[PDB]
Design a protein around this nucleic acid. Structure first.
Ligand SMILES: [Ca+2]
Ligand SMILES: [Ca+2]
Lengths: 207, 210
DNA sequence: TATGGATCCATA
DNA sequence: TATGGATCCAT
């Protein structure tokens, strides 16, 4: 997979240029988001482009989470204290890791988004909450760009649609990364779809 | 319907105490969110409680919207300049009205959220954007409470679930309203899901104003 | 290729 | 029991 678009707040740029741990942290996330391949036999991510919204999205996150977890030792589904300790409501963020050296400690929160675009607003808010309460020093969201999302399940998170809201992160170290497939062709298999929501396969007890 | 839970930021409290137009705005919203009644013929809103998620959410909003639009002159689909003009990306606000008393104008943005809880974060962030850029002076979000939502379409926005995030509206005038039915019974018809529960009512679009 | 939903899923 | 995801829908 490729990182095509990217927004980095002023506070995040300052860390990326002056702090090694954030540079290391940033390096590990980029290499991870680029990891997804398709099909399993390929070295690159190719998206089937037969029709609009033809591919499901479930398998996309796999390799990204494997590298982050297995190789980089990141923590999956990390619950925030503000959420499950104090307020006792809401779930954990996708990934989290503590970058340490000497007395310095940098905590990075992150969310990978292939859920509905509205789900990305929650993700941004959770990370904003975690940043406000001093649990993470940097927040990062990963999501497909519109060109790629056009071939994925209708209404999934796309960089361009969440973009008008990036400013709601002012004064806080945040980074938004939009990813894209390396090739677009009808020579590959369709990424399978679930029976979720309004899929013709979902059980609807109303008709 | 009943308004059972509510969070009012301190900035909104102040406006509600010192400003009569904001006081009027609130009362129109309050009366509108209490207007829904199940059995169109019924006095109050009784919700069928036979199963988990047994009712659709669309008809629940009809009376509230209709009172705000037709009786109180609120408009639907007010595009924000920051979104329509500057960023040229993003949809409009759900309900909008400009209050006037002489030289004073009070713009109130409001979203009636019966979408997925994740959609509520979009609603709040959009009102926050309108607020931050001085396009509105007060934001309002209507949503059922957890107990009511248990019998509504799975994962619908609910007061308690958005609650952890109310603090993100800090330093800005915002109102969160949680409503609930007056009764739960199995002898009232199910609120239909899908197209059956869609009203083909023409709404008062802001674009069609003067 | 726009946009806020409405609904049902999968895991706990 | 609760919570983050995923899939189409109506305009
Ligand atoms: Ca997650
Ligand atoms: Ca995610």
């Amino acid at each position: 997979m490729e990182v095509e678009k990217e927004f980095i707040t002023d506070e995040a740029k300052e860390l990326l240029s002056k702090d090694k741990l954030i540079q290391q942290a940033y390096n590990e996330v980029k290499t991870s988001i680029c990891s997804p391949i398709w099909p399993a036999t390929s070295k690159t991510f190719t998206i089937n482009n037969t029709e609009k919204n033809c591919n499901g999205v479930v398998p996309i996150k796999e390799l990204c989470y494997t590298l982050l977890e297995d190789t980089y030792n990141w923590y999956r589904e990390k619950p925030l204290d503000i959420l499950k300790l104090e307020k006792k409501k809401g779930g954990p963020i996708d990934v989290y890791k503590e970058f340490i050296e000497n007395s310095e400690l940098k905590r990075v929160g992150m969310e990978f988004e292939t859920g509905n675009i509205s789900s990305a607003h929650r993700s941004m808010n959770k990370l904003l909450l975690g940043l406000k309460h001093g649990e993470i020093d940097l927040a990062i969201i990963l999501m497909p760009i519109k060109q790629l999302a056009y071939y994925l399940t209708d209404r999934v998170t796309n960089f361009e649609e969440l973009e008008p809201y990036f400013e709601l992160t002012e004064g806080q170290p945040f980074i938004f990364i939009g990813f894209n497939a390396e090739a677009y062709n009808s020579n590959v298999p369709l990424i399978p779809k679930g029976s979720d929501g309004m899929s013709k396969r979902s059980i609807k007890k109303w008709k």
